Design an enzyme around this catalytic site. Structure first.
Site, PDB file in Angstrom:
ATOM      1  CE  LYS A  54      -6.010  10.320  11.363  1.00 31.76           C
ATOM      2  NZ  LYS A  54      -6.205   8.958  10.843  1.00 31.76           N
ATOM      3  CB  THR A  74      -9.914   9.397  10.923  1.00 34.36           C
ATOM      4  OG1 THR A  74      -8.933   8.436  10.505  1.00 34.36           O
ATOM      5  CG2 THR A  74     -11.192   8.697  11.374  1.00 34.36           C
ATOM      6  CG  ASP A  75      -5.342  10.493   5.888  1.00 32.67           C
ATOM      7  OD1 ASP A  75      -4.316  10.185   6.535  1.00 32.67           O
ATOM      8  OD2 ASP A  75      -5.324  11.168   4.842  1.00 32.67           O
ATOM      9  CG  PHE A 127      -8.412  17.513  57.018  1.00 31.99           C
ATOM     10  CD1 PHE A 127      -9.479  18.196  56.439  1.00 31.99           C
ATOM     11  CD2 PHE A 127      -8.534  16.154  57.231  1.00 31.99           C
ATOM     12  CE1 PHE A 127     -10.620  17.521  56.060  1.00 31.99           C
ATOM     13  CE2 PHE A 127      -9.671  15.479  56.854  1.00 31.99           C
ATOM     14  CZ  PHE A 127     -10.736  16.171  56.277  1.00 31.99           C
ATOM     15  CB  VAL A 134      -8.586  19.799  49.261  1.00 35.53           C
ATOM     16  CG1 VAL A 134      -8.630  20.021  47.755  1.00 35.53           C
ATOM     17  CG2 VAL A 134      -7.181  19.362  49.677  1.00 35.53           C
ATOM     18  CD  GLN A 135     -12.964  18.226  51.012  1.00 34.16           C
ATOM     19  OE1 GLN A 135     -11.833  18.605  51.357  1.00 34.16           O
ATOM     20  NE2 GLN A 135     -13.375  16.978  51.166  1.00 34.16           N
ATOM     21  CG  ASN A 184      -4.651  16.117  50.142  1.00 36.58           C
ATOM     22  OD1 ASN A 184      -3.561  16.701  50.104  1.00 36.58           O
ATOM     23  ND2 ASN A 184      -5.391  16.068  51.237  1.00 36.58           N
ATOM     24  CG  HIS A 197      -2.034  12.024  51.051  1.00 34.00           C
ATOM     25  ND1 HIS A 197      -2.924  12.963  51.539  1.00 34.00           N
ATOM     26  CD2 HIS A 197      -2.789  11.097  50.410  1.00 34.00           C
ATOM     27  CE1 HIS A 197      -4.155  12.616  51.193  1.00 34.00           C
ATOM     28  NE2 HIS A 197      -4.105  11.486  50.517  1.00 34.00           N
TER      29      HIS A 197
HETATM   30  O1  LIG Z   1     -11.668   1.926   9.586  1.00 39.15           O
HETATM   31  C1  LIG Z   1     -11.465   3.113   9.318  1.00 39.15           C
HETATM   32  N1  LIG Z   1     -12.441   4.036   9.647  1.00 39.15           N
HETATM   33  C2  LIG Z   1     -12.378   5.385   9.367  1.00 39.15           C
HETATM   34  O2  LIG Z   1     -13.321   6.116   9.720  1.00 39.15           O
HETATM   35  C3  LIG Z   1     -11.210   5.790   8.721  1.00 39.15           C
HETATM   36  N2  LIG Z   1     -10.756   6.958   8.276  1.00 39.15           N
HETATM   37  N3  LIG Z   1      -9.605   6.798   7.773  1.00 39.15           N
HETATM   38  N4  LIG Z   1      -9.255   5.581   7.860  1.00 39.15           N
HETATM   39  C4  LIG Z   1     -10.227   4.865   8.427  1.00 39.15           C
HETATM   40  N5  LIG Z   1     -10.296   3.523   8.722  1.00 39.15           N
HETATM   41  O1  LIG Z   2      -8.341  18.340  52.717  1.00 41.37           O
HETATM   42  C1  LIG Z   2      -8.645  17.175  52.985  1.00 41.37           C
HETATM   43  N1  LIG Z   2      -9.911  16.733  52.645  1.00 41.37           N
HETATM   44  C2  LIG Z   2     -10.409  15.477  52.923  1.00 41.37           C
HETATM   45  O2  LIG Z   2     -11.566  15.197  52.561  1.00 41.37           O
HETATM   46  C3  LIG Z   2      -9.516  14.630  53.578  1.00 41.37           C
HETATM   47  N2  LIG Z   2      -9.585  13.380  54.025  1.00 41.37           N
HETATM   48  N3  LIG Z   2      -8.474  13.054  54.538  1.00 41.37           N
HETATM   49  N4  LIG Z   2      -7.655  14.020  54.457  1.00 41.37           N
HETATM   50  C4  LIG Z   2      -8.243  15.071  53.882  1.00 41.37           C
HETATM   51  N5  LIG Z   2      -7.752  16.322  53.589  1.00 41.37           N
HETATM   52 CL   LIG Z   3      -9.205   5.696  11.480  1.00 46.23          CL
HETATM   53 CL   LIG Z   4      -7.625  13.888  50.837  1.00 47.44          CL
END
Ligand SMILES: O=c1[nH]c(=O)c2nn[nH]c2[nH]1
Ligand SMILES: O=c1[nH]c(=O)c2nn[nH]c2[nH]1
Ligand SMILES: [Cl-]
Ligand SMILES: [Cl-]
Ligand SMILES: O=c1[nH]c(=O)c2nn[nH]c2[nH]1
Ligand SMILES: O=c1[nH]c(=O)c2nn[nH]c2[nH]1
Ligand SMILES: O=c1[nH]c(=O)c2nn[nH]c2[nH]1
Ligand SMILES: O=c1[nH]c(=O)c2nn[nH]c2[nH]1
Ligand SMILES: O=c1[nH]c(=O)c2nn[nH]c2[nH]1
Ligand SMILES: O=c1[nH]c(=O)c2nn[nH]c2[nH]1
Ligand SMILES: O=c1[nH]c(=O)c2nn[nH]c2[nH]1
Ligand SMILES: O=c1[nH]c(=O)c2nn[nH]c2[nH]1
Ligand SMILES: O=c1[nH]c(=O)c2nn[nH]c2[nH]1
Ligand SMILES: O=c1[nH]c(=O)c2nn[nH]c2[nH]1
Ligand SMILES: [Cl-]
Ligand SMILES: [Cl-]
Ligand code: NA
Ligand code: NA
Ligand code: NA
Ligand code: NA
Ligand SMILES: [Zn+2]
Ligand SMILES: [Zn+2]
Ligand SMILES: [Zn+2]
Ligand SMILES: [Zn+2]
Ligand SMILES: [Zn+2]
Ligand SMILES: [Zn+2]
Ligand SMILES: [Zn+2]
Ligand SMILES: [Zn+2]
EC number: 1.7.3.3
Lengths: 295, 295, 295, 295
Positions: C10, C57-58, C159, C227-228, C254, C256
């Site tokens: 779920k 899942t319920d 940069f 940034v690197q 980034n 811009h």
């Molecule tokens: O098709 C379903 N699969 C599940 O695993 C499930 N669990 N609740 N309802 C469900 N319906």
């Molecule tokens: O910080 C930056 N890293 C990059 O790799 C880059 N490429 N263009 N601008 C950039 N600025």
């Molecule tokens: Cl489900």
């Molecule tokens: Cl970038």
């Protein structure tokens, strides 16, 4: 101090509904997200800790489910009208209900060239929406829309002849890319109540289809002078094809695709007529808006 | 201290390319987002402020554009292989290039039943991706995938017979909704270099299509015993239909749709056989994973 | 075909816990998002529709809540170890439990210069995370991290001296902006089991604090060559200050900020020493990674 | 058809500005996102492909940068007023300029207990915003706000005495969690023009500080009867402390934290007075709104 305006309710209520045809075995699904905000004689909840006037938002949520169980959820204009009418009728002191519905796509799958009876695909984040304002004594005001319809054309867009002064660097162009996310809204004539909304039900799906079709065909076919000029054409056509609409509104971003000059690298030509590789720009974007009504 | 691993490059590089057929007027568009990370004899950039070993990330970006201008961008397996091979060949001290490509959908529009020559729609946020690792002296390792394929079936999913103990509340079911976002990866046999990748080019689009078709048909048609059992069927079929794949991996969320008991309200029946209205759950979600290989 | 790997569980399980001191009235809150994936003799759930091997899942979700109720949720390294140990001990056929915890900030509010007993603020989307892999017969492997720590320095970043060839357009600089979102991970020595994890409990909060302090001070004070070079300094200091860590990994975008040449407008000078107004770039971004270990 | 409304401009314009004190060496940074939409005698751009009336959105973008270079960007109320006034004064046919500014936090770092001269941290996604509408002949209308201020209190929130009918399941409570994301707006008296805005400049930062302080203290200290009652108290206090404001508006989600009944598992008690572990709910959420003005 005094309360000048107040509204409250439940937002982001996810709702799924399935219809199962017993005869054919065909199932059809609908999924929405709903918000409901209420107004009325509720100010004392704010000013005096008077919760007696509050229909709990949790209860509003329950009511959305119950209403979806007992009524059609499509077209959304209808569902929203039913839901909003419920609140103003059920509660004397509630005088307006604002209902927004976002409809999510679950399009029936085709498998081996045949429509499958119970399997669906989200084809697109495009939404169909409604905003329905039900106001006691003043009917039902509906704004229908499509949104998130993302399109691109690779030529037959132009932009020249614009104002040029000391703030201007943009080059005129007779051939550019145009891409947008369409948000289009059609505002219906006020309806007097639920009976009148129901009387026009088929028009809701039909008008959504018209709006979508006009949008796509006009976008594709217009040798566009600007976003402004193209969107106006869309709006005028939609108004001409549904008399029960009063206005059409578009809000369109211009999602820019910039040329990349590569001539510094071995004289590589990638501008103008030779432009092949472009840099889509996330921001900023033009934003162009219009509301068109009848003359 | 010492550097145990290092890689660096440019991420989120948006790229559009258009092809224009002069004869027919038909244009075709491609849009991607690219990341490239390099490895090699670069540790002194970290340990000694030695930038002489750094191919600037800005230059990596330029190189993506230039490579897109001078080579096919489709299939993405090919483009990624060309791009990664460039870095390890051009720079003696660079010994690996990791290239990830996300391909965005621009599907040609149909207008009035005819394919339009230069207008496209984003039908779906579904992506087609590749991860291409080009390692000097060790060929080209390609993982192809589709992701963001969102589907739902409204019946013909079951889940019963699971372990029951003092932590268990889940009721067995013979009829539930199943919805997921498909993320499926097929891992190719190592390729010795660009020539071998090129020799298999048609298989890339064909195998993506097979994977997608198998996924959709199996999802739609399998009366599913569990997500586990259904996904395994998908994987085994894909392996059976492309001998140049070594493994298929699925990662599937179980996007739960819960019944809503409304019987507290006027005895309304909305559970079991009467379930119509459901609550889609945003979280949490089951997450089910498998990697399947050949026996 | 055969299963080569499988895990399931779920994801996206939101958990809040409050502690209430009866004597003082002071309340303290914790909020997390948890994912748990299990491995073991579960392949037949995939290959033969054998759900008997599935802890639903319920039920996994229930177990997360129950475990949070009956045990400390802090430090997250401890909670994750308890939770993962539970699954492998309780279920004979489950042989590994992978537990990821994202911890959300709820910092106690100061009101009128005094710490409030039960009110908190989300100061920052910065997260503290753990990934805890509990493997039967092979102890407990813990990777602790901080992420989403967003910082900017307006000078004292440089940069220059990078490789220059026909793909290079980037100008050397001796004074630029540097902004990043810090993602830093420290990998603990394998622990033999829960007793050993418990024996080192104070070191978890202390080492997170050291990592954060070193990151911020080094970022602020290093007249950075890249940034690197800066990230390597951070890693070497953290290793020097906690002997129970084996490696430190950084992944730094980034983000811009580009100068804007305005000299076309009335000779306005906004580059080099005169640069005041910049365009933050949403994409693309540089991505710089290193894993540092002990010599 | 006819144009009923139209506006257009550039959205999502990211702007950074640095100030460098030559004497002290202290640097200060500002980062915003700006949108500008213009209105005026522009309808023919929509109806007749008349681009001569269009100040290009690209030029609007340039103008934002230029204006930021030549004027203070703080307080944002001032910057927005300057920018909007520029458009209506420079262009005879432009009669309104709508300027929205979102201000991003870059808080000066403290290193070893001392404020660092050029290093900053994003502490929180909380924003400070303005919406400035400059309308020719009708002055300058400013709405200031804070948004994205996310808070939680673990007790001293109540909700009882609400309407109970056949749609109601919610249990009354005298002790619950309350968490929200504060969106608060104060609407200034109309200003006649730039001179009047400038005459009140110190009030903008002071009133933002008051609004924030009142919000936090009232949230922390009010033994809340409802979101409605608490937010009203905030608004009334802010109005009492700045006479140049006309209204205060709050929009507050109720971000629910649900109890988890664990009594099915070994009688574990985790409800009511024994509630320790809760399930934060992503959706739906209550949404509570009020606009408060002067009596
Ligand atoms: O098709 C379903 N699969 C599940 O695993 C499930 N669990 N609740 N309802 C469900 N319906
Ligand atoms: O910080 C930056 N890293 C990059 O790799 C880059 N490429 N263009 N601008 C950039 N600025
Ligand atoms: Cl489900
Ligand atoms: Cl970038
Ligand atoms: O009126 C509304 N429109 C929306 O798009 C929306 N989304 N959430 N709530 C909403 N209400
Ligand atoms: O279609 C467009 N409309 C505009 O108003 C504009 N401004 N710049 N580019 C533009 N393109
Ligand atoms: O993105 C935006 N959409 C709008 O509709 C709008 N209106 N004003 N500003 C706006 N920004
Ligand atoms: O290998 C990668 N896979 C991805 O999905 C991705 N996204 N960004 N960078 C990436 N690199
Ligand atoms: O969401 C997730 N996807 C994964 O593939 C995964 N693996 N471990 N945890 C995980 N969570
Ligand atoms: O191992 C994991 N790390 C993560 O960051 C994460 N997020 N969801 N699940 C996850 N599992
Ligand atoms: O955004 C990324 N983060 C990573 O850690 C990574 N590794 N490969 N590609 C990557 N892209
Ligand atoms: O008026 C506006 N308010 C906003 O919050 C916003 N965001 N984008 N554009 C905007 N315009
Ligand atoms: O403070 C609250 N206000 C409401 O209107 C409400 N409704 N349900 N819960 C609530 N809590
Ligand atoms: O989320 C929302 N915020 C709002 O201000 C609003 N107004 N109507 N609907 C709304 N939904
Ligand atoms: Cl534009
Ligand atoms: Cl609420
Ligand atoms: Na009423
Ligand atoms: Na090499
Ligand atoms: Na076990
Ligand atoms: Na004017
Ligand atoms: Zn809403
Ligand atoms: Zn709404
Ligand atoms: Zn990446
Ligand atoms: Zn990558
Ligand atoms: Zn996960
Ligand atoms: Zn995980
Ligand atoms: Zn905007
Ligand atoms: Zn705006």
């Amino acid at each position: 101090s005094a309360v000048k305006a107040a509204r409250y309710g439940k937002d982001n209520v996810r709702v799924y509904k399935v219809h199962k045809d017993e005869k054919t075995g065909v199932q059809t699904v609908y999924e929405m997200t709903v918000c409901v905000l209420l107004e009325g004689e509720i100010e004392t909840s704010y000013t005096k800790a008077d919760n007696s006037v509050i229909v709990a938002t949790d209860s509003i949520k329950n009511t959305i489910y119950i209403t979806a169980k007992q009524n059609p959820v499509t077209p959304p204009e209808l569902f929203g009208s039913i839901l909003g009418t419920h609140f103003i009728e059920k509660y004397n002191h509630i005088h307006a209900a604002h209902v927004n519905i976002v409809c999510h796509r679950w399009t029936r799958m085709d498998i081996d060239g045949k429509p499958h009876p119970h399997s669906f695909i989200r084809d697109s984040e495009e939404k169909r929406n409604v905003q329905v304002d039900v106001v006691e004594g003043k009917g039902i005001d509906i704004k229908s829309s499509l949104s998130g319809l993302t399109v691109l054309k690779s030529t037959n867009s132009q932009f020249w002849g614009f104002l040029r002064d000391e703030y201007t660097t943009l080059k005129e162009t007779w051939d550019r890319i145009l891409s947008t996310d369409v948000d289009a809204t059609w505002q219906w004539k006020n309806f007097s109540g639920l009976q009148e909304v129901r009387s026009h039900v088929p028009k809701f799906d039909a008008t959504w289809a018209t709006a979508r079709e006009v949008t796509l065909k006009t976008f594709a076919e217009d040798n566009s002078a600007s976003v402004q000029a193209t969107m106006y054409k869309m709006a005028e056509q939609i108004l001409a094809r549904q008399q029960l609409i009063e206005t059409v509104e578009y809000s369109l971003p211009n999602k820019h695709y910039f040329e990349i000059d590569l001539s510094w690298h071995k004289g590589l030509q990638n501008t103008g007529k030779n432009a092949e590789v472009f840099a889509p720009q996330s921001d900023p974007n033009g934003l162009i808006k219009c509301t068109v009504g009848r003359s």
